[PDB]
Amino acid sequence: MKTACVTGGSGYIGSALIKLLLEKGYAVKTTVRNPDDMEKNSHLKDLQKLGPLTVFRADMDEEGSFDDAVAGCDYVFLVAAPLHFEAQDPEKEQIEPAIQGTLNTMRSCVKAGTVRRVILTSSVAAVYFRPDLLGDGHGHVLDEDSWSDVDFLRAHKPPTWSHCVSKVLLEKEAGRFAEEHGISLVTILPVIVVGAAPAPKARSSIVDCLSMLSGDEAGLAMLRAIQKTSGEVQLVHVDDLCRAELFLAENATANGRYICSRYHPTLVELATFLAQKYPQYGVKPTDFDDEERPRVTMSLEKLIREGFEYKHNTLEEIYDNVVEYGKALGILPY
Amino acid sequence: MKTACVTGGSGYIGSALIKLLLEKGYAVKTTVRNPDDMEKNSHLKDLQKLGPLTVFRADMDEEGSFDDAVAGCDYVFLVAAPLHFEAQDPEKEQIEPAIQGTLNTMRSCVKAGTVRRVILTSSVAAVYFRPDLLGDGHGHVLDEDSWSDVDFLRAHKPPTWSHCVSKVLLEKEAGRFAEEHGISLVTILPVIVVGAAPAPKARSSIVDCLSMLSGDEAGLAMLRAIQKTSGEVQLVHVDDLCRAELFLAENATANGRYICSRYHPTLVELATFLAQKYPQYGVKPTDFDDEERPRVTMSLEKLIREGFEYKHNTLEEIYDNVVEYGKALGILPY
Ligand SMILES: NC(=O)c1ccc[n+]([C@@H]2O[C@H](COP(=O)([O-])OP(=O)(O)OC[C@H]3O[C@@H](n4cnc5c(N)ncnc54)[C@H](OP(=O)(O)O)[C@@H]3O)[C@@H](O)[C@H]2O)c1
Ligand SMILES: NC(=O)c1ccc[n+]([C@@H]2O[C@H](COP(=O)([O-])OP(=O)(O)OC[C@H]3O[C@@H](n4cnc5c(N)ncnc54)[C@H](OP(=O)(O)O)[C@@H]3O)[C@@H](O)[C@H]2O)c1
């Protein structure tokens, strides 16, 4: 019956979203950059056994190249994103591409004429950087009215500044475009995403949410930075994120942007849980002892108030299947 | 003018609910056991300044004494309840009287013929005691389908077992009665209640939530016992509880029982916050350095799902005015 597009079928979240859509009885069109690279897209053949799944070549840097994948779709899920933070001149090799790639895909949706709603996958990176509140000494519950401070980040350019900036600006641009062209756009703002997916070359948050077990120094540093800034980390199961995305597509009254987040542990509480459940990795929870900081946390109320239900509600349920995914991926050594 | 009854106007929560009802424009009737006790009831005279407030003499052990107080009321808020003590026969001295006193007030509610809805104040004490969930070493989120285990509590009679049993059995019986007589009954289930109220002789949870500042040994043990069991405590501001009670009376869709809770700190997080904001009391957060424990927490979703909004959402807003209240009561030395 209904048809939907997912950009970046080879991606972590995009692969998970394709599965849900097929299981839910959708015809699905997805885009990858190199449909012939079976090292990254071998899962697509398996996913085709669940329902009608069509693969298209596309690149956010090639204008109009999403025209065919998005043609005929009732819903489009803008999941793919550059995400190459790297360095150099981020304003031009990260921020401007991200903004333009988003507008590229948006134009293909207007040219299709069929798209009843675009669902954009942004990030709480576009929510949390509030230099008027961080450093306050007080706790804060941030909601969807909160936007990361682009001006402050451009001025001081702290590490990873271009990530929050890309997300804020691509979302503002996509929203204006949508209003300009009369197309319905809804945005979901995930926290750290945890869980298994079909993608065979996923890295992304799997590396970070598993870093206590692998000892990956970049994942560990990313977790500690979030905790020192917000007094906690925030986690959501990929399958809840996917269901929330589909929920926003299918509920007519859905409107605006939505935090998607479920469990907010401190690092010592997360490490204690992993050490007890997976002792083979030798986690030492005291490695993560930290002061009790004021909590700058994410409000969970918007999706809930509108009738959505998370199914992975405890730490145990959020980590129900990610460890085996990391092992299969090679992210974990055993 | 809509009219509502609040049982136990001398009490902590009862007084704050009276105050809310008046500000919202209700005609309020309330009960106490000695209307002439102006030391204990001075606030009832002060509250007549903000709206119509009539005081009656009633006792839950005295059949029919609530007839006049609930007569002509659209809503009846059953806040009053006998306080817990340690009895040689908690079945005859506590459990059975708690049931009967609840049914006593229920009868007056039908006999009045006007009562559109009864709001019962129970407690998460009727939710949390789940021997499997508490003992299995895993985290859990309890919701409104969870009931404290009466059979287990009777079989093994841990200290204070009769409190949870009294709340479960009286809620069950009140629900049976309401069905059998055609009166709408909604039940609210609060956690530890924090904040200033009009009552001049209030103790209850004010004692417990200030016990870190006061040194009160029974309060500190109460907090520590909850942390030992659940890995945390659960707090809600008395004004949100009062607004939630009113919300459940005025929304015809409301149905069943509702947890009322908002902020769930560990003891060391609560002590750290109090030490930093109230140094004059010499709180030592390290006194609460617990190994931590699996977290058996409360679901907040039911009231949110049905449209209710909490106003005290950070730990600091939950403690926005209770320290001054404990001083005015003499619970806090200075
Ligand atoms: N995972 C989390 O914890 C998290 C949290 C918050 C927000 N998000 C956001 O959710 C989205 C999905 O992220 P993810 O975790 O699934 O990471 P991912 O596995 O790296 O997915 C990124 C996708 O974008 C594709 N892509 C990048 N540049 C492209 C381009 N120029 N043209 C076409 N495709 C391009 C990638 O394909 P190639 O590999 O072929 O380049 C890939 O499929 C992202 O927008 C992320 O920023 C994720
Ligand atoms: N405060 C919390 O953290 C919390 C948490 C969960 C549930 N609750 C429940 O919420 C309700 C209000 O509690 P509270 O904090 O406001 O404690 P409270 O200040 O002690 O109020 C309890 C009231 O019950 C009245 N009462 C006791 N026996 C009575 C009787 N035989 N007849 C008539 N009245 C009687 C008492 O009036 P007298 O002075 O005349 O005895 C008293 O005012 C309670 O049902 C409690 O179980 C409170």
Numbering used by the authors:
A (entry chain A), B (entry chain B): 11 to 344
Reproduce, without paraphrasing, sentences from the article in which this PDB structure was first reported.
From the early stages of refinement, a difference (Fo–Fc) electron density map clearly indicated the presence of an NADP+ molecule in the binding pocket of PvDFRa, SbFNR1, and SbFNR2 with its nicotinamide moiety properly positioned for the pro-R hydride transfer towards the catalytic site. The bound nicotinamide ring in PvDFRa, SbFNR1, and SbFNR2 established a syn-conformation, whereas the adenine ring adopted an anti-conformation. However, the crystalized SbFNRs did not display any NADP+, thus had to be added for co-crystallization, which indicated that PvDFRa had a higher affinity for NADP+ than SbFNRs, as confirmed by our ITC results. Having both apo- and NADP(H)-bound forms allowed us to observe the conformational change upon binding NADP(H) in the SbFNRs. Compared to the structure without NADP(H), the loop region, 89Val----Pro100 in SbFNR1 (and 89Val----Lys102 in SbFNR2) went through large conformational changes upon binding of NADP(H). Thermodynamic parameters of SbFNR1 were also assayed with ITC for association with NADP+, and it had a Kd of 13.91 µM that indicated a 10-fold decrease in affinity for NADP+ compared to that of PvDFRa as predicted from the crystal structures. In SbFNR1 and SbFNR2, the corresponding catalytic triad is composed of Ser-133/His-173/Lys-177 and Ser-133/Tyr-171/Lys-175, respectively. His-173 is unique for SbFNR1, as all the other compared enzymes including SbFNR2 have tyrosine in that position. In SbFNR1, the 2′ and 3′ hydroxyl groups of the NADPH ribosyl ring were hydrogen bonded only to the sidechain of Lys-177 that was, in turn, indirectly connected to the sidechain Nδ atom of His-173 through two consecutive water molecules. Thus, compared to PvDFRa, the effect of Lys-177 on lowering pKa could be less significant.
Dihydroflavonol 4-reductase (DFR) and flavanone 4-reductase (FNR) reduce dihydroflavonols and flavanones, respectively, using NAD(P)H to produce flavan-(3)-4-(di)ols in flavonoid biosynthesis. Anthocyanidin reductase (ANR) reduces anthocyanidins to flavan-3-ols. In addition to their sequences, the 3D structures of recombinant DFR, FNR and ANR from sorghum and switchgrass showed a high level of similarity. The catalytic mechanism, substrate-specificity and key residues of three reductases were deduced from crystal structures, site-directed mutagenesis, molecular docking, kinetics, and thermodynamic ana-lyses.
